[PDB]
Design an enzyme around this catalytic site. Sequence first.
Site, short mmCIF file in Angstrom:
data_model
loop_
_atom_site.label_atom_id
_atom_site.label_comp_id
_atom_site.label_asym_id
_atom_site.label_seq_id
_atom_site.Cartn_x
_atom_site.Cartn_y
_atom_site.Cartn_z
N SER A 144 0.86 -1.18 0.00
CA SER A 144 0.00 0.00 0.00
C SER A 144 0.89 1.23 0.00
CB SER A 144 -0.94 0.01 1.21
OG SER A 144 -0.21 0.20 2.41
N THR A 145 0.71 2.10 -1.00
CA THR A 145 1.59 3.24 -1.17
C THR A 145 1.29 4.36 -0.18
OG1 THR A 145 1.84 2.70 -3.52
CG2 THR A 145 2.42 4.92 -2.87
N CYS A 146 0.10 4.35 0.43
CA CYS A 146 -0.28 5.43 1.34
C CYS A 146 0.66 5.52 2.53
CB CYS A 146 -1.72 5.22 1.81
SG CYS A 146 -2.06 3.59 2.51
N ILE A 147 1.12 4.38 3.04
CA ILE A 147 2.04 4.34 4.17
C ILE A 147 3.38 3.72 3.80
CG2 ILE A 147 0.31 4.44 5.99
CD1 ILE A 147 0.52 1.33 6.10
N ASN A 148 3.61 3.47 2.51
CA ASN A 148 4.87 2.91 2.01
C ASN A 148 5.21 1.60 2.72
OD1 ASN A 148 5.01 6.10 2.17
ND2 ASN A 148 6.11 5.50 0.31
#
Lengths: 830, 711
Positions: free
Chosen positions: A802-806
């Site tokens: 998930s890119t939101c929290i890397n």
Amino acid sequence: MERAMEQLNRLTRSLRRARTVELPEDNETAVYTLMPMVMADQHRSVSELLSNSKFDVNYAFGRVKRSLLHIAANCGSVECLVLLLKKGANPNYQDISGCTPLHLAARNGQKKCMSKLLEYSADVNICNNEGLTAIHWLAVNGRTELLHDLVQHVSDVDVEDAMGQTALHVACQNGHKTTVQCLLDSGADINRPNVSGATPLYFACSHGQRDTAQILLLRGAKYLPDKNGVTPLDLCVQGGYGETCEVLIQYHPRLFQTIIQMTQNEDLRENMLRQVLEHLSQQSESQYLKILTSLAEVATTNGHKLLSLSSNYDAQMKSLLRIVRMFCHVFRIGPSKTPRSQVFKPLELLWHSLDEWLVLIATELMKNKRDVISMTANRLSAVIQAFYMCCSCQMPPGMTSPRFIEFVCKHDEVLKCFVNRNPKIIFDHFHFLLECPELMSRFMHIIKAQPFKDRCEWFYEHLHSGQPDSDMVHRPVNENDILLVHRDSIFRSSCEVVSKANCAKLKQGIAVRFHGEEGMGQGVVREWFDILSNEIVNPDYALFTQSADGTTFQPNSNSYVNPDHLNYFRFAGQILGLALNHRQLVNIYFTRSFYKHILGIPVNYQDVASIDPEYAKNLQWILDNDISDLGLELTFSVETDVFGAMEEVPLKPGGGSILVTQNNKAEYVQLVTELRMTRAIQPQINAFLQGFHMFIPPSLIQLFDEYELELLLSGMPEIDVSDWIKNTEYTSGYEREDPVIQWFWEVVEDITQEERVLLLQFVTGSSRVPHGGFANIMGGSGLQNFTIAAVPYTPNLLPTSSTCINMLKLPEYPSKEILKDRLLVALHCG
Amino acid sequence: MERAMEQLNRLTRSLRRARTVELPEDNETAVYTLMPMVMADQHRSVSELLSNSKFDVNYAFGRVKRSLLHIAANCGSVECLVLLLKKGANPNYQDISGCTPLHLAARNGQKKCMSKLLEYSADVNICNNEGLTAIHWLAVNGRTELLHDLVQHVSDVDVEDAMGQTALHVACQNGHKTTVQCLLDSGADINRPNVSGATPLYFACSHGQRDTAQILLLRGAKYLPDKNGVTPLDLCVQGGYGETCEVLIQYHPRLFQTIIQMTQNEDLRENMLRQVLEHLSQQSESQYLKILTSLAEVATTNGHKLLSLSSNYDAQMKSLLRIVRMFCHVFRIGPRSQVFKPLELLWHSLDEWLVLIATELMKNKRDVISMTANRLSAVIQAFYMCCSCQMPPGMTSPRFIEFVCKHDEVLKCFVNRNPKIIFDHFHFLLECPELMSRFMHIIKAQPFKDRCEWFYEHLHSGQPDSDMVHRPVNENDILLVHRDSIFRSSCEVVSKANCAKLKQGIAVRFHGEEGMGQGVVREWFDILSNEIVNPDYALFTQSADGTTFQPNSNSYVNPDHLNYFRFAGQILGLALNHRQLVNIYFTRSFYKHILGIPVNYQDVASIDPEYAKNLQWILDNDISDLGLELTFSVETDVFGAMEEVPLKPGGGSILVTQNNKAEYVQLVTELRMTRAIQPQINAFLQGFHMFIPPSLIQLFDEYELELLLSG
């Protein structure tokens, strides 16, 4: 009494009637005082001069060494030359080049001057330096009446000049109908050869004088070639005169079967042999059908030659390409109904040859399958190439021929072998494949079997191919090419200029100037792209909005507030297409949804997680376990609130009350996600893609992927793996001393730069590179570096991120090689 | 699993409503997930989510650290504003730039947003980092209805920002007449001064809004300058708004006098001042003569001090030529003559004793004299336009001719001292045939080198946008001519071109080559000269010497001869315009024809010496010396036809005058030399003098022009 009285009355008549007194005997002064009265043919003045003069009338003067009679011939005077000749003038005088006064009178076309000049025993056989006699000068201006009486006094009408051309040759060159007729009936030879052994018709066809040739043929001209053996019709097609060919072909019907068989020749221009046979084709429907007919067996017999693999092929396929391209073009222009089917009967024997040729080859190759293969594949591919163009000419363009589609499908596996051997053949020989999306999808996996950067220069070559003078250098910047924009309204000003501009010239060159600025250069255009990149991310226009990722952007759902939003969307597509055309990078990164929409492939559940992970998490659960036993309220319909208004959206028309089961939940999930992603932006993305498509054809761009397309736009930023590792935090189950991260950090180090960015796209989807290093990474507008989580390992389980929290969850692995292949297939599954 | 039934119910209703209900405790996730509803004004959805959420509605996010209330205000939503404010949102919260949701509502001009914000006790005096309140944005947007609603809740109507502006000034800047009407009705100050002393009238004249100025003057505004003393009229005249000037004329009857007596200023442009003057001139004929009267004393009082006192030379005469040129222009723009007659007397009387002064110069004649002459020359020069204003143009009045001719000796004396005084102060002699010729021989005494340099300076003078230093080669200026048909192609392209395009720049191109440079122009003119001298085109003929050429006599020897004769004049004018030598060589009589003076018998001898030899011999003898025979009718042969002309019109001479041969020889020579070539001379000169006017080219003799063109 003394001469005082004699001079008194001579001056008296001078002041009374402009009369003369005496004339000096010196030659140069005497002649240089006697132009003006000869200008207007003042017979009274010159008559008085002859009364009292001792000046010779055969004097040479001037840069041309003309005589007094030459002025009379040039000026058209008649009375002065009559008395000049009576004085004892010689009509056989010559100038520097040997110009007889007959020639000068002929030069101005003076009927009267030559009549009396010839009457005074003037030789007619005198020729100039170039050998042009009197009649040759008359032939330049083509005065037939002056020819008629002159040739009566001329012994031979076949006199040749220094070049070897008779009066007929130059007369036929000028295309004067009456002159060439008068010369021929005077006793001239109709087939008189020149020094090069050329008939008069040889020069007639060179200049394309149709009407002059028609009399010559109808009067008994003989069709003969020159000394080199080249036929006049060969130069006539090489002269581009279709009308003259029409006269020759009807007079000699055997030329019809002769003109069609030089079509195999390559020296003559293809576009110039186009004009000659189009003109004959459009003469009548009967000529239209036979020309289409005649080319049919010509292609048939030429194709049989190509079945001999031992012969040379480079010249043969070019001739085959030449004929079939012209063969379909004549069918496209139309006649001057059922004759289209009638000409297909010459065509149907061509197909019968063509279909038989490949099936014996195709069956032979598949039996062999169950390097001479390379050349044999290339030869029939041109046959398969020729198999398409005359298939596509059957009906107006817009669809692929069903008879073409059926036969291609039944040999698709054999066709799959050739694209496997050489990917370079899909563009030039399989250019028709770009026009058929259905066959494009089937061969898409073969095209993606070589994920190379070679495709990058392929696409640039394909885009630039076919454009005349396709060089991006040494292009003059004209005033019309320069587009003026104002920085106060640069976003709107740029829209206006490109809308009023021409697509073809903008694709060829770029020239944009800011108002009030004089310093021009390629850097200004680069800065113009950069400021445009900063303009599209500005929320003032309300066209794109920041995602939950915090560094990418997605189309704004409420863009309808701006009245010119649709114009802005197409403007954005145009400028991005121009940047891609001219190899210009863009420093703006967008969400995966935007790339999927412009590419055309449908989005999936992972796309929803990029913006709304919480909803996708609920959707992830519903697609995993059974739903029929749960007995939920899944009825293929949802009740939603949009724009403050209540709405019910049934996923199926009339099926809004059908319970969703395990079998049909796959389309239930796909439809609800597709509706929520695209319905609010469907007209917006449609306007954007068509704006991008006006400069970048959809077929050409379809060969790329979502990650490949973003990489081209974002360029190739450098990745410092060692720096990235040393300033990266590590928590969530896996310790810094755990060997798994060491394997992961070793895998990213040893993979290729192409695989490194692919891994970065898979884990985050952003090609961000911070200034001064890879520290201080922003995740969701907050300070957060890349992290890896720990999850239990099960067979056929791939990591997700998930890119939101890397953050990425990586299954536990016992070896680095196990970790690498699991990551490698994860990159392939992206 | 944890709360299976509760989560199952949540799962089903979330998917049925197409969006999730539960919201994770992450602030970043919460704000982004709430975006798709806040721009959509989905009041029911956000209310349901907020009831199931434990977040803060005052959380700051974004580049400017904006809030959820900011997003709703930006999108123009109304109902979602109420829910946020009822849940604890602070309407007075501001961004890092000091922007509160009131400004965004003011920026979007939403009546509903501002009304509900005011209902929730929102401060009206909130200002950004620049000290600008929501009133400024409402005034910019021109929302008069919103201004009236807000001013009812605003205690201080005359609040000043950092620059010192107020709602009255900023509305005047935007030019909204309705907004200033409401502000004036609110009782705000009408003469509020700025930190620089600016008033509402200060911006009114700067923008020139006629309706706003009329309303401002109606309410009782006061007239005063700024701290620097800049009168508001100065900005109005420097803004070129004649509409506001006329309104202020009606309110202030002294305004027209003040602006006219302030005309002598030098800071304002020439045509810019003419625009306002003509605007206030054509309003009415009574005003047309009223201003003409008013400028009449200004002109005569300005010349009175130039008559008496001496001051800065450039400052004085420039001011006079400035005013008088505009005074005659406004009259030319438009019983009018009768009213002009007394106005003539104001400066004609002033000029009358200038004639008395100039009479004293003759008495003095019969250096402070030079400087007086410069002042006298300018007013005499200015008096020409005064005489030119008396009648329609195209002619020179005998009035100043009578004055100048009676006072020519002092004019001759100073012209000898300064020949260049003719160019500027005597620029009017270009239209007076009597005065050009009398001063023509006087200026002929100057050396050629000085004369030619003056001619080149004034050849390029008076041409707007005349740049001779690397002018860009425009696409239109490029002329394409084929090498084989250079004579025909050049004539065709010149025919479709314009004089102005080739007057400044030149560009010649040929097919198959990209030749460019000064040498290309030089060879283009050289090849054209070589092609016209020889009789190949049958347009020119050789002379007696053989190295000199003269035009062909008979017309239509060449069918397009008239076009070439005009074309020849065009190209030779361009060659002289760009100041390079040419290889052309014509007869001496050719230069006499192009100049104007009659052709003497010596030029006739250049063609046939014997004919002129007899004519010059009888000129030196009496009527019947040695039994000479004379006739009063002559005969000429043309095209073999015998024609008779009885010399002087009306019949032959009957009396002996000047040995009975002086004018008779002159008549026969002129008739024989120009009657046969009259139409072709006119075609040539017309193409030549359209580039250089005859007045500015007749100042050289035949020898001077020959050297400058040939070298």
